[PDB]
Design a protein around this ligand. Sequence first.
Ligand SMILES: Nc1ncnc2c1ncn2[C@@H]1O[C@H](COP(=O)(O)OP(=O)(O)OP(=O)(O)O)[C@@H](O)[C@H]1O
Ligand SMILES: Nc1ncnc2c1ncn2[C@@H]1O[C@H](COP(=O)(O)OP(=O)(O)OP(=O)(O)O)[C@@H](O)[C@H]1O
Ligand SMILES: Nc1ncnc2c1ncn2[C@@H]1O[C@H](COP(=O)(O)OP(=O)(O)O)[C@@H](O)[C@H]1O
Ligand SMILES: [Mg+2]
Ligand SMILES: [Mg+2]
Ligand SMILES: [Mg+2]
Lengths: 239, 322, 311
Amino acid sequence: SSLKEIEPNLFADEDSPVHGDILEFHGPEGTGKTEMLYHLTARCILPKSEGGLEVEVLFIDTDYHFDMLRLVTILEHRLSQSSEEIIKYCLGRFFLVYCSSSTHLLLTLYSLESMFCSHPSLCLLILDSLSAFYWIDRVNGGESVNLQESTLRKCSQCLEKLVNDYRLVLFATTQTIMQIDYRPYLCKAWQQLVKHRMFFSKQDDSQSSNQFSLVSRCLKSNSLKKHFFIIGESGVEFC
Amino acid sequence: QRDLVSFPLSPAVRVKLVSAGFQTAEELLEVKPSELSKEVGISKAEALETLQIIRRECTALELLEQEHTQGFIITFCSALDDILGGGVPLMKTTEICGAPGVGKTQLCMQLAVDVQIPECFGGVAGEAVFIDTEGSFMVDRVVDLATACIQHLQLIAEKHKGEEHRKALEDFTLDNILSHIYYFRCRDYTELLAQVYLLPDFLSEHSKVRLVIVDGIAFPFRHDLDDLSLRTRLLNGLAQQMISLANNHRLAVILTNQMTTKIDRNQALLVPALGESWGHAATIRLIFHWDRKQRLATLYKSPSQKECTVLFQIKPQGFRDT
Amino acid sequence: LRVGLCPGLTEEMIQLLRSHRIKTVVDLVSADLEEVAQKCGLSYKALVALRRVLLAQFSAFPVNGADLYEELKTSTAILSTGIGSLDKLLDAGLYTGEVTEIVGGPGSGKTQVCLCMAANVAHGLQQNVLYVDSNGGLTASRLLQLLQAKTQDEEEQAEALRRIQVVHAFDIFQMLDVLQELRGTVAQQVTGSSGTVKVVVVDSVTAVVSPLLGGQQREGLALMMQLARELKTLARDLGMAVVVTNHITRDRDSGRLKPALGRSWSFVPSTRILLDTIEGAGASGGRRMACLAKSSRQPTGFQEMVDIGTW
Ligand SMILES: Nc1ncnc2c1ncn2[C@@H]1O[C@H](COP(=O)(O)OP(=O)(O)OP(=O)(O)O)[C@@H](O)[C@H]1O
Ligand SMILES: Nc1ncnc2c1ncn2[C@@H]1O[C@H](COP(=O)(O)OP(=O)(O)OP(=O)(O)O)[C@@H](O)[C@H]1O
Ligand SMILES: Nc1ncnc2c1ncn2[C@@H]1O[C@H](COP(=O)(O)OP(=O)(O)O)[C@@H](O)[C@H]1O
Ligand SMILES: [Mg+2]
Ligand SMILES: [Mg+2]
Ligand SMILES: [Mg+2]
């Protein structure tokens, strides 16, 4: 479970067997966060023979924007030899969970622990749009700051406990609402829990309609990394 | 499972409820009001109000039958009626724009007169409500238009030589038609909003009204109003209220707008005023403009018919053809 | 806490556990239950069993990818819009289970496209469709004209019209009420297999949302987010095809076309269609521009020419 093999391109020099890492994605609409997650799942789900890793992955769906036809098309167009049996065998490992509210999210977080401890093979976790319910619970609590964000703080505590308990690697998805620009609006604790930021940007022109820019910083070094990549029907490819 | 946010309860009571651990309306129905009230620190009156507001919250064939059983309002213009599908449709908001002197007010007066035509001749036989914001309502013009309609209907009935036509025209006299037009006057936009708020109950008691006219909507909103966002919010709310009222009370609504000049490069175009978002409010939009000495009516936006151009004229009898 | 929901709950323990908190079951599940046995006095063996069963009935369990693959192999479907240009633009029809948004200028094409799609689905597939008319832009004569353009049998037209339901909602509350009523009635009527609704169209969401927005308030944005969440869960958790229409705005600093309702609403739909009128030559009539601004299965920015006067 070394970070050099996971993504040597985005992660320049952070290679070590990870005891736990938190990654989050930030970007406006239609930039490619979901496509990047699809590429990561494709590279993490295939058999070891076809450049895969053969390790478990769990996907929490909150935006309700997960598309399975796109995922199966990406997996079919990624590998070399394609068949129904092998694709079924590969997709027998993907895990998907649905949520509807912050309280329901916390209940699902707590409930997952049974299967989670029953499976030591689980090593990678995916969460998307943890700020989907930001406005709802910000308005429910009124002016009382403590009244709002409280369930989100409890959820962050539970996630941190799990990830530092059973050595997970986590990728998160955020949203751009207000205003290298960045204006945080979540709880302070989860802001501290982050390790790197993946700022997502998109170029307007049709020539660069497939090329996008990524900026990453390290909390302990404040070093900037730039990356250009091209999207495709077969998945995501780099420059 | 229905969220509490989906209900029109007070922000304070919703904050208290979410503080006490309430997130669904279904769980509220199984709790005695006393226990929940003492748990959340809410008095009896507002608790009962919450309980009652929670409690309170048509196939296309029927729509076709309803559309066909009620006619349109004729404008005495054959080509305009043809391009409108029969005239001004009920349950639909209509907007008219044009430079000064084209005849928007004449059209409003003609519609107010025509809405009372007996159904035996193809009319709706309903009243009319006229709201004036610029003081352009002249009774003499209405009298002339009513007399012209009287003469036209009498001539048609005499030529046809029916039996029920004469009976229908017997009560269709100048006094009767003039007594069925209700006049209101608004100077500021606050007065217009107040009259709009009073409109529902008045229409409830006066159930035979089939027409609502607001002659002049740009004037109250284009002067002494610096905040554009407030004007936009007020206009959106007014449009929503007007369409809701028109659909609920089976009414035909006509609004009058004013033109303005838009300059690009070195040429100027005449466009309707009150911004761009106002264009979505009107269900049907018409535009009057000049061409040499001829007056043209153009159907700009409509979800039922196609764009057309109609030549009309203003005569001593009123809005007419040619 | 509530009584009668799960077995094993006693009328004494509920008032005994008042020491910590009363809000929700999160108090029972998100506490360190070791100290409860002495803070109030509880049996260790019963407490863990009650917490486990409560967490079981009050959560969700993950489903394996292969099972989801197999179940979508027999559940999802694709419904053509009745226009060859749109079909080839968005792969021969729209997919149930997602949210489709149509954005255009005043009077461009949105209502006509919605009406033609509804007529096709009601006649070409024999299924029930609900229409939510908010701005008053729906005349039955247009639907009759489209049906006549499709077929000539009067009884066929009547039967196709009998599968179209129209509801009026001039504010956010009425729309939420009717949508929740549909959710409840469909969730209750899962046993049956006839009369279900597969496509619901909202004529205009900007009509009932714009008055709330504007100023320094927060309730309008929260209501918009709640409506978006309701639409998304109706589309996904039930497998339905939802189509909504929205207005278009012109940016000030950049001067570029931009969808209304703001950045928070910008993330709601999954497929975006933009309609514009071709200026100059070929203007007016049905000749218009159709573009794809957002999709999860196609690259964006593509161009296509469509007409709204040939059906
Ligand atoms: N026979 C016809 N029947 C109806 N509409 C037609 C016909 N022929 C052409 N059209 C066009 O249909 C359009 C209807 O616009 P539509 O209501 O679909 O647009 P919209 O953007 O949804 O409007 P709104 O913002 O007013 O709700 C008109 O602009 C008109 O040019
Ligand atoms: N087959 C494909 N080939 C090329 N590009 C594609 C293909 N399918 C999708 N895309 C592109 O992928 C881009 C990313 O779309 P997507 O909705 O996944 O973005 P996202 O930023 O992750 O989502 P969101 O806007 O919901 O935050 C789209 O702009 C689209 O142009
Ligand atoms: N008694 C009449 N006989 C003939 N024409 C008239 C008579 N009264 C008014 N008109 C014509 O009708 C037009 C009325 O325009 P008007 O409705 O006032 O436009 P607006 O309301 O946009 O200012 C005038 O141009 C005038 O020439
Ligand atoms: Mg996405
Ligand atoms: Mg006038
Ligand atoms: Mg429309």
